[PDB]
Amino acid sequence: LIPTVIEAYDIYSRLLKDRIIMLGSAIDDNVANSIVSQLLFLDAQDPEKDIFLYINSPGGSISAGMAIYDTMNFVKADVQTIGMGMAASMGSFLLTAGANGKRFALPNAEIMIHQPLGGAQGQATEIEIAARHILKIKERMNTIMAEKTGQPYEVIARDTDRDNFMTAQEAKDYGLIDDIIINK
Amino acid sequence: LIPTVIEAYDIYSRLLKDRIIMLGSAIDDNVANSIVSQLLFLDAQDPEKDIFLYINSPGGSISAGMAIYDTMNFVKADVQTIGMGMAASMGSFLLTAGANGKRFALPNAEIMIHQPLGGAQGQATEIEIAARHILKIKERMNTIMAEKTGQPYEVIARDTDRDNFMTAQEAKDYGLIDDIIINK
Amino acid sequence: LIPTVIEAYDIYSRLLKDRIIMLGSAIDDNVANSIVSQLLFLDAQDPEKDIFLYINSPGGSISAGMAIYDTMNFVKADVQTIGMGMAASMGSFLLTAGANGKRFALPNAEIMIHQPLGGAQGQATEIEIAARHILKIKERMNTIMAEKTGQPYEVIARDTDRDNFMTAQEAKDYGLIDDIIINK
Amino acid sequence: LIPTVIEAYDIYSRLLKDRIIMLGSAIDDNVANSIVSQLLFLDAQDPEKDIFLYINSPGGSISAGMAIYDTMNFVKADVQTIGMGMAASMGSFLLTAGANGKRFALPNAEIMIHQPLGGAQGQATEIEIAARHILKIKERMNTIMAEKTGQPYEVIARDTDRDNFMTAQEAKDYGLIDDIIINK
Amino acid sequence: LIPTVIEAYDIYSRLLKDRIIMLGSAIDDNVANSIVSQLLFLDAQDPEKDIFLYINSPGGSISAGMAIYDTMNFVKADVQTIGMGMAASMGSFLLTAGANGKRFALPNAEIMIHQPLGGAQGQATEIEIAARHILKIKERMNTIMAEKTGQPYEVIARDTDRDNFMTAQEAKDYGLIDDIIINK
Amino acid sequence: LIPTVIEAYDIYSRLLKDRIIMLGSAIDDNVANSIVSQLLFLDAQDPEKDIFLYINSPGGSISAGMAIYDTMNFVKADVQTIGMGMAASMGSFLLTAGANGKRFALPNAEIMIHQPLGGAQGQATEIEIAARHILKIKERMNTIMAEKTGQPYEVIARDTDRDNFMTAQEAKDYGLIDDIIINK
Amino acid sequence: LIPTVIEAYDIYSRLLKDRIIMLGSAIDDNVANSIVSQLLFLDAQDPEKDIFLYINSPGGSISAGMAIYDTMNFVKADVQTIGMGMAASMGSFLLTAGANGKRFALPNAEIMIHQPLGGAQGQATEIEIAARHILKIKERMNTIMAEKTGQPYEVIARDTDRDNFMTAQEAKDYGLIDDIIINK
Amino acid sequence: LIPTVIEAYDIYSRLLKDRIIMLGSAIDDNVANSIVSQLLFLDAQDPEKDIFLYINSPGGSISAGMAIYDTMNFVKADVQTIGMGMAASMGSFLLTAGANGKRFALPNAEIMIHQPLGGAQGQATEIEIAARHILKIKERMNTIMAEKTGQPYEVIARDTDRDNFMTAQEAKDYGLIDDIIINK
Amino acid sequence: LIPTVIEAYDIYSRLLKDRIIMLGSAIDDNVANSIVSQLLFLDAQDPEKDIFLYINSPGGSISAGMAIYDTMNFVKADVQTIGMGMAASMGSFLLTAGANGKRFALPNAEIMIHQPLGGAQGQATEIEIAARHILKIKERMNTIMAEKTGQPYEVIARDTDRDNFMTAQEAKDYGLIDDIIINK
Amino acid sequence: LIPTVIEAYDIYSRLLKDRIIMLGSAIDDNVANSIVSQLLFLDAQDPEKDIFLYINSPGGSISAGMAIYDTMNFVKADVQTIGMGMAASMGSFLLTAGANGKRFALPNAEIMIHQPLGGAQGQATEIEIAARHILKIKERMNTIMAEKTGQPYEVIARDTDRDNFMTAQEAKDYGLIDDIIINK
Amino acid sequence: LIPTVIEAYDIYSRLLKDRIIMLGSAIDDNVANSIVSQLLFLDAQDPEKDIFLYINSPGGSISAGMAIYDTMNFVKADVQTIGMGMAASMGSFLLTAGANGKRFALPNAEIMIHQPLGGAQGQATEIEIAARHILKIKERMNTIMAEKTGQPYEVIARDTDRDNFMTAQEAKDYGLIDDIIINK
């Protein structure tokens, strides 16, 4: 059940009117396109007002995530990220990708930086290309993360290739989020 | 879940009101029909106003994509193409098919030029028709891409027959896209 | 996703207001019922104005398509056919069945004249009636095609009994379509 | 997909407003109920105007068809029947059961008189009851068909017991339908 | 397809507005609840105008039908019953349960008095409770039928325990229905 | 599990050496052919020694049963029948078919004479033949039963068309079995 | 896995060579036929030596157990019963059916007297036949157990109608078994 | 379960040792291959000794049956046929194909001469080959049956195209079988 | 059921002792492996004695059948082919591949020369290699057929590319088989 | 069906006695284990005699093939490889890995050098490890193949990374196989 | 297919006769029990001769492998371990668990030290028991590895918790195996 608010909206539609986007499922291609569209709609509505992207996702397709990421940068509006419950892999990468000074996590949010295989080599059958591609895309993901966190590249490259859990406080200290929001 | 904006639309229907079409999945015949109708509808509304076609597609049915392609050329309105996430096979072909100087890619989009089997011989069961037909369709697709990329036929013929990924930058250097859009 | 235009419509219904019928799937009884009702409705609205039937279909049930064909003739309004993507079997038949001077194909449509088995003998168990009936319906379709294409009966009968692919230009020469439309 | 005209109807409901009932599938209990209700509704709307019943059906359950048959006779208004595409078994029986002088068929329609088993013996497990019942129902259908067509009983009985296809012209000669409608 | 009349009703709701209830399926607890809810509504709108309950049902759950039975008696308004197609078991029982002088059948309706097992013992695992109960309920059904038909209990008890089909005429002589309606 | 006796036999094979045939499942076509073969093998082995056919079967295919019946008569050896647990429909008919004076039942054997539909009309699609055939085969089954039991034909015809349970004692009194075997 | 002793038997066959029958599953028709066949065979080898039947069964079909029950009485050899793990419903009925003085249970055996529903009315569709038959079969089971246990009928009729568990010692005091075996 | 006689054979293998082949199921290609091999094997053993082929088959694949038929004629040994239970379509055709004066039926065997569709056009997808081929196969089967029954082609052509049952006696009068075997 | 001859054999193994190989199903890799091993084994037993290959097959995988074909030539012994029932595609190819003067068909075998798609391009994704390869293997099979039949290359290429049914007599004329065998 | 020679072997086991190993399916872990064991067995039987490895495989798991490859080298005896029908990927790699001067192929065999993904990165989820591993395994296969064929590394690397079919003759020229065997 | 050597063994049983055990699949409890049973047998036949355990396993259940581990130590005979193809997790753990000086790997074997989760907490629903246990068992596995490899516990504890592939050479240097065998 998803309730229907009359001003007739569904609950998410009503939140969208207040510029809130809920990313609360695994990031596949249908999810990406729904996020992208919402970011396109909001920026056309009012490109001055901030946008609030709440993230609760175990991750998903790397190209689908990169599409959300690129649209976050494309839009004129500052995109604020709030991690809740769990932000793992592409979810945690999207959290870190929020506008500077505006990346948040609720006190008890699980955060995993590890980005696993995920099938980044699309439909490639040849070994030479498929292996080498996923290293390139691995490499330019580690670079965007080094920049956003201020961690040396090599630390990032090491940390995203191992299972590692973080509390909201450790994530703040790491540079993945700017602050922990408890209230307001 | 697809949110429902009220001015009641779904999120894509609202984006259609801003002349934006979202091609975000495999190109089967349902998809092709939906797109073609969106293009036809948009052209009827305002023939002098550009159409923005966002591509995030792993590819799909060759004749289906060809229906979209022909309709892109059929309509009077210029059809801009913006590649995000992934544009492969028929995805990448429709991307190159965008209006002159109006094909774009976001900074991290993956582009694959490779166009595979695809079931191009419909319901044919005879060897000398089917095999000859799939060479004939391959050749005429090479020819169109050579025209649209500026590349010699030989180069397209070699490149579309193998798995290779391109950055948005390499896509620009190739003649595939006109520019990388980063902001605004 | 089928987008929902407001002037409450879906995309095909909005096209229907402009006298456009989208036949974009395998022809079965549901499809046949749908198209017929669309043709019946449009003719009742304005018998003087033409109807535009876009075809993208691999074919299907012969009796279902024949219901369409008969209704295309029953209506007072001229029925233009625009083949796109693929027009095979019954699809290619209904394309040719369009009004004189008003049968078109987009430049890269694949056209198959071949009409295979299908199941024209409904639920008949007796060999004598079933086999004779499919020859009778074969002959009676070959005749309608010969009249519409101008081709001699013996040629049509030779060409519809085998797997055969035609380009839009070849189909114009043969008399399947009147013209290839590229623009407007 | 069923399109939605705005005067907010679906296509069939719009045709229902012009007193057209579309029967386009196997006659089961759901379909029968739908058709009976549509007839009941139209008769109560205006009992003096004709009802048009288009028939494209492979047939089905005998008591279901017999419910539609009874209602056709029950209502005050003349029920005109148009056979299109295929009318077999129950479909053809209902086509013949249309108002005197007002039973038609499109030129390429297939008609099958053959009326098979059809599960007429409901839930009976006793041999002597089920077998004698199905012979009794089989007898009273032949009788009804003799009266409608003007063919001798022994002629009908011979034809309802064998697979056999009729063209629209043969059906006219037989007495199943009054005329072929080609235009208007 | 359930067509949607605009006065914006579905076809059965439009009929419901003219005090007509269509019981045209196997009687389970969902159907029971819907019919009961329809009778309750109709009586509360107008207790003085008659209700028309159309029966085309193979029967079903005994306690479900008995809920319909009791509500038919509970409501102030006279419930007329019209049997079409098939009224078997609980279908035939509800038909006879109609208001005195107001029980009808269309000329070709199949009536089956036979009331078989039907799981009347709910989920009683005990043998001596389950068996004695179905005897008790069978007894009280026979008793209710005997009174509505004017038949002796012993004849009803004999006829309810065997497979026999009745025509509309036989059912009238028996006392199941009051008249056979052909027209109007 | 079916145990394996060394003299290596399976338990039934070992019983077959002592001229015992177990018919202990529903009579389908694979079962019939297994029974028939066993009766053919035993009679070839020694046509003087009696055969013991133990029957525990809910019935099955009528033509399959008739094949067993015919082979029981074909063979030279007297075929003794012993009903145990349950002998219903074709099982009870096979029990009655045992050699005169040599049809038995164990004290607590359930016996049902009722022979229901069972699909005796093979693959017939036409009503006239299929109904009339199953009455013929009904009739010549009642005749064989009248003879074997010594009951008047009409009593048999009435009793085999209703659900009716019998104890071994009632079956003896009826003439279905010659005696009840308790011991030895 | 069922191991294969050589002297080449599976483990059960090797036990059968020492006159031991293991009934260790639900009592359906396959199992019943197997137990019946093992008893017949063992009585054939040596009718004077005793048979040991170990029982671990939740229950199963009544007629199937009745088959085993009758065969136990039919054979000349004494059938000793031993209850291990669980003897419920038909399993417990068979346990009591063992030879006088020779009914046993291991110390920790669960014994459930409750004899439930278990579809004792085969496939009878008539209410009054099916209900009265199951009461008849229920009564003749109570009678048999009253005879085997020494309990008055009224005690058995009440006990076999409710769930209760008995320890080995309680079963002995009740008269279900003759002794608890512990050693040797 | 298939019993295992020791002299180790299965029951059919032992019957093969007495030159008896059991055709007791639908004639698919596995069955046809098995039979053909049995005939080939038997002919190799003793060319001068008759082969007894028991038929109990609803029919099946036409080319499969034709393989058995040709092999029956191929072998030097006379192949007697004995129809039991049911011989329909390809079953009844193989029955008539038995050696001169050596085709038999048991007193209660059901014979159906009707030979239906059967998928005689293998893997053909073209209309004018498949339809013509199935008439050609129908004609040559009629011709063989006319030869084997002594009936005029016209009579066979009429009779095999409709559902009719025959008693073993009617089969004898028709020329289908040489005699009814009742005893020995 | 596959019968188990004793001289421990199964029927095909017994035939194998007489140098008979049964190819009776669709040709896949398992079948191909089986036949090859059978041919390899027989040639090692006695290279001087001929091998008899019976064919009843709808065809299958081209590379699998080609393994058979190559092994038919590799062996020292002459390989006779006897087509029965159906020999289509690869089946009809391996038939023609038999030793000179030693290729036969039974009088009523259906023979199809048509070799359709199959999947000759294994697991190739590239169109250029896949389409060219199937033409190369088509040509190379047309050549082998032309050599074996004596027919001119251009005729074979025309006839193997279309659906075509041949009788045993037509196949003899064409040069597919050397003779039709009726007896012995 | 796998036939059973009596010297009691199945067909493959009889060929195993003449030192022939048949590899005729996709190389998974079960198949690898079977082949390794067969090699281990033959080497221990007689290390001085050659082993014949027939290869008809689409390929499969890389570590599985690499186990067979290692064992081929591990054993003392020369392992001769014969390619028949199809040898692709792992199949072709194992064909080339046969004893120097003793790698063959039948004349119509298809060989594919292309070695795709194949799940070489086992159960690794870390990106950098899985990608670099598959490049390392890909490198050491190319190296092995360069040494066996005598082709330059850069030539092998080009061919193992693309779809490509070779005839037996081309494989000889390439260095994959030493000779084509046609006869003997 | 598992070939069946006659000295009548299956291939693995023949190898078992030469003291060879093939562990070539995922280690679950069935495989555990089989390997254990094989070690127990071999030690009881001859305690003085060595046992050869071949490992090609992705690993599996921890408590299953540990059963194999303990039995390897329990038996008197030295257990040599030969790693081929893939020895991962519990596969690699068993490989190192081999007898001192007697642990080998074939040149191209993939070794993965990584021991992941593997459900080591059975069915413990409690959090503090399940988590503390897997830590405890992980600790004692690391301890056993440290002793067998001569590596410091801290290095083993670090390497067992990460995805890393080792070649045969690396594994030798590490102390996992004693030597790489190429031949003999």
H161 closest CA partner among H178, H150, H176, H145: H145
Residue K51 CB partners (closer than 8 Å, separation 6+): K19, K21, K39, K42, K43, K75, K77, K78, K79, K80
What is the 3 state secondary structure string of chain J?
CCCCCCCCCCHHHHHHCCCEEEECCCECHHHHHHHHHHHHHHHHHCCCCCEEEEEEECCECHHHHHHHHHHHHHCCCCEEEEEEEEEECHHHHHHHCCCCCCEEECCCCEEECCCCCCCCCCCCCCHHHHHHHHHHHHHHHHHHHHHHHCCCHHHHHHHCCCCCEECHHHHHHHCCCCEECCCC
Q: How far apart are alpha carbons C1 and C3 in whole angstroms?
A: 6
Give catalytic residue positions of K. Answer: 89, 114
Residue with tokens 């769930």: G163
Structure tokens at C100: 């004189």
d(CA C134, nearest CA chain D) in Å: 10
Q: Do J38 and K107 touch (CB under 8 A)?
A: no
Residues in C closer than 8 angstroms to D11, CB to CB, are 34, 37-38, 41
Q: Do A131 and J134 touch (CB under 8 A)?
A: yes
Structure tokens at H106: 């048991």
Backbone angles phi, psi at J51, to 5 degrees: -110, 140
D32 and chain E in contact, CB less than 8 A: yes
Q: Do E183 and D123 touch (CB under 8 A)?
A: no
Looking at residue C26, the DSSP 8-state letter turns out to be -
Nearest to C3 among B13, B133, B137 (CB): B13
Residue K174: CA count within 13 A, CB half-sphere: 24
Rg (CA), chain A: 17
Between the alpha carbon of residue F16 and those of residues A53, F19, G34, G40, I60, the distances in Å are 79, 5, 14, 12, 44
Q: Which amino acid is at G155?
A: V
Between the alpha carbon of residue J154 and those of residues B156, F155, J97, the distances in Å are 24, 95, 19
CA diameter of chain G: 57
Subunit partners of chain D (3 or more CB pairs within 8 A): C, E, F
Please note each residue after which chain H is broken, C-to-N distance over 2.5 A, or write none: 7
Between the alpha carbon of residue D117 and those of residues D158, H115, H164, the distances in Å are 15, 19, 15
CA diameter of chain I: 57
Q: Do D112 and C129 touch (CB under 8 A)?
A: no
Residues in B closer than 8 angstroms to A38, CB to CB, are 3, 11
Q: Could you tell me how many CB contacts below 8 A there are between chain F and chain H?
A: 114
Identify whether the C-beta of residue J115 lies closer than 8 Å to the C-beta of residue J90: yes
Residues in F closer than 8 angstroms to G76, CB to CB, are 183-184
Identify whether the C-beta of residue D85 lies closer than 8 Å to the C-beta of residue D110: yes
Looking at residue H47, the DSSP 8-state letter turns out to be T
J11 and chain A in contact, CB less than 8 A: no
Q: How far apart are alpha carbons A176 and A83 in whole angstroms?
A: 11
Looking at residue B100, the DSSP 8-state letter turns out to be T
> What does E14-70 look like in DSSP terms, one character per residue?
HHHTTTEEEE-S-B-HHHHHHHHHHHHHHHHH-SSS-EEEEEEE--B-HHHHHHHHH
d(CA B94, nearest CA chain C) in Å: 14
F19 and chain H in contact, CB less than 8 A: no
Mapped onto helix, strand or coil, the DSSP state of residue C147 is: helix
Q: How far apart are alpha carbons A92 and A88 in whole angstroms?
A: 5
Closest chain C residue to B13 measured between Cα atoms? Answer: C3
H125 and chain F in contact, CB less than 8 A: no
Q: Could you tell me how many CB contacts below 8 A there are between chain D and chain E?
A: 113
Ramachandran sector of residue G98 (left: φ over 0; alpha: ψ -120 to 50; beta: rest):
beta
Q: Crossing angle, helix E62-74 and helix E127-149, to 10 degrees?
A: 40
Ramachandran sector of residue J148 (left: φ over 0; alpha: ψ -120 to 50; beta: rest):
alpha
User: Domain spans of chain H?
Assistant: 1-184
H22 closest CA partner among H47, H45, H52, H46: H52
CA diameter of chain H: 57
> For residue H57, with 0-12 CB atoms within 10 Å meaning exposed, 13-18 middle and 19 or more buried, which class applies?
buried
Q: How far apart are alpha carbons D161 and F126 in whole angstroms?
A: 6
Measured at the CA of C30, the angle between CA C29 and CA C32, to 5 degrees, comes to 60
Q: How far apart are alpha carbons D20 and J79 in whole angstroms?
A: 79
Structure tokens at I54: 């019976």
Mapped onto helix, strand or coil, the DSSP state of residue C48 is: coil
Nearest to H128 among C126, C132, C161 (CB): C161
Looking at residue G91, the DSSP 8-state letter turns out to be H
Residues in C closer than 8 angstroms to D165, CB to CB, are 121-122, 124, 129, 133, 136
> What does G15-44 look like in DSSP terms, one character per residue?
HHTTTEEEE-S-B-HHHHHHHHHHHHHHHH
Chain Cα centroid distance, residue J104: 12
Residues in C closer than 8 angstroms to D38, CB to CB, are none
Q: What is the resolution of this structure in A?
A: 2.6
Q: Do C138 and H130 touch (CB under 8 A)?
A: no
Residue I113 CB partners (closer than 8 Å, separation 6+): I92, I145, I159, I160, I164, I166, I176
Q: How far apart are alpha carbons I81 and I84 in whole angstroms?
A: 10
Identify whether the C-beta of residue H77 lies closer than 8 Å to the C-beta of residue H129: no
Subunit partners of chain I (3 or more CB pairs within 8 A): B, H, J
Q: Do D161 and F127 touch (CB under 8 A)?
A: yes
Q: How far apart are alpha carbons J76 and J49 in whole angstroms?
A: 9
Structure tokens at B107: 């900074």
G5 and chain E in contact, CB less than 8 A: no
Mapped onto helix, strand or coil, the DSSP state of residue H3 is: coil
Q: Crossing angle, helix G127-149 and helix G62-74, to 10 degrees?
A: 40
Measured at the CA of B27, the angle between CA B22 and CA B28, to 5 degrees, comes to 125
d(CA J169, nearest CA chain K) in Å: 30
Identify whether the C-beta of residue A34 lies closer than 8 Å to the C-beta of residue A71: no
Q: Do D183 and C125 touch (CB under 8 A)?
A: no
C139 and chain H in contact, CB less than 8 A: no
Chain Cα centroid distance, residue C131: 25
Chain Cα centroid distance, residue J123: 24
Kindly state the helix (H) or strand (E) to which residue H38 belongs, with its residue range: helix H29-45
For this PDB entry, the determination method is: X-ray
Structure tokens at A67: 């599409």
Q: How far apart are alpha carbons K149 and K153 in whole angstroms?
A: 10
SS3 content of chain C, % helix, strand, coil (to 5): 45, 20, 40
A161 closest CA partner among I85, K6, J127: J127
Q: How far apart are alpha carbons I103 and I107 in whole angstroms?
A: 13
Residue with tokens 């002629």: D155
Beta bridge mates, G111: G87, G166
Measured at the CA of C174, the angle between CA C169 and CA C175, to 5 degrees, comes to 100
Please note each residue after which chain G is broken, C-to-N distance over 2.5 A, or write none: 7
J69 and chain K in contact, CB less than 8 A: yes
- First and final C-alpha spacing in chain K: 27
Catalytic choice (D25, D63, D114, D133): D114
Structure tokens at G147: 């005879």
Backbone angles phi, psi at F86, to 5 degrees: -140, 130
d(CA E42, nearest CA chain G) in Å: 35
CA diameter of chain E: 56
Count of Cβ atoms closer than 10 Å to residue K87 Cβ: 32
* Topology annotation, domain C1-184: 2-enoyl-CoA Hydratase; Chain A, domain 1 (3.90.226)
Mapped onto helix, strand or coil, the DSSP state of residue B53 is: strand
Count of Cβ atoms closer than 10 Å to residue J92 Cβ: 28
Backbone angles phi, psi at D64, to 5 degrees: -70, -50
Residue of J7, J31, J84, J181 to mutate when probing chain I, most I C-beta within 10 A: J84
Q: How far apart are alpha carbons K93 and K115 in whole angstroms?
A: 9
Nearest to D138 among F128, F135, F157 (CB): F128
Q: How far apart are alpha carbons B14 and A40 in whole angstroms?
A: 10
D135 and chain F in contact, CB less than 8 A: yes
Identify whether the C-beta of residue D66 lies closer than 8 Å to the C-beta of residue E111: no
Q: How far apart are alpha carbons F68 and F79 in whole angstroms?
A: 11
Q: How far apart are alpha carbons C149 and C161 in whole angstroms?
A: 16
Identify whether the C-beta of residue E47 lies closer than 8 Å to the C-beta of residue E78: no
Count of Cβ atoms closer than 10 Å to residue G75 Cβ: 19
d(CA I75, nearest CA chain J) in Å: 6
G39 closest CA partner among G25, G60, G23: G23
> For residue K130, with 0-12 CB atoms within 10 Å meaning exposed, 13-18 middle and 19 or more buried, which class applies?
middle
d(CA I9, nearest CA chain H) in Å: 10
Q: Is J34 a residue of the active site?
A: no
Beta bridge mates, I20: I52
Mapped onto helix, strand or coil, the DSSP state of residue H166 is: strand
G126 and chain F in contact, CB less than 8 A: yes
Count of Cβ atoms closer than 10 Å to residue K99 Cβ: 17
Measured at the CA of F88, the angle between CA F86 and CA F93, to 5 degrees, comes to 120
Count of Cβ atoms closer than 10 Å to residue H29 Cβ: 20
I80 closest CA partner among I54, I56, I106: I54
G115 and chain E in contact, CB less than 8 A: yes
Identify whether the C-beta of residue H32 lies closer than 8 Å to the C-beta of residue I85: yes
Residues in C closer than 8 angstroms to D23, CB to CB, are none
Residue F173 CB partners (closer than 8 Å, separation 6+): none
Between the alpha carbon of residue F71 and those of residues A58, F35, F176, H30, the distances in Å are 70, 9, 20, 26
C162 and chain H in contact, CB less than 8 A: yes
- First and final C-alpha spacing in chain I: 27
Subunit partners of chain H (3 or more CB pairs within 8 A): C, F, I
G95 closest CA partner among G115, G76, G78, G80: G80
Identify whether the C-beta of residue D146 lies closer than 8 Å to the C-beta of residue F136: no
Beta bridge mates, J88: J112
Looking at residue D176, the DSSP 8-state letter turns out to be S
B126 and chain I in contact, CB less than 8 A: yes
E22 and chain D in contact, CB less than 8 A: yes
H110 closest CA partner among B3, F122, J137: F122
Q: How far apart are alpha carbons I119 and I123 in whole angstroms?
A: 9
Residue K29 CB partners (closer than 8 Å, separation 6+): K61, K64
Q: How far apart are alpha carbons J171 and J177 in whole angstroms?
A: 6
Between the alpha carbon of residue E88 and those of residues A93, D151, E27, E58, E165, the distances in Å are 65, 34, 11, 5, 9
Please note each residue after which chain A is broken, C-to-N distance over 2.5 A, or write none: 7
E28 closest CA partner among E91, E109, E113: E91
H109 closest CA partner among F75, F137, F57: F137
Between the alpha carbon of residue F129 and those of residues C98, D72, D137, D164, H84, the distances in Å are 47, 31, 14, 17, 21
Mapped onto helix, strand or coil, the DSSP state of residue K82 is: strand
Q: How far apart are alpha carbons J102 and K106 in whole angstroms?
A: 23
Identify whether the C-beta of residue F109 lies closer than 8 Å to the C-beta of residue F169: no
Structure tokens at I59: 């065809």
Residue of D41, D54, D128, D139 to mutate when probing chain E, most E C-beta within 10 A: D41
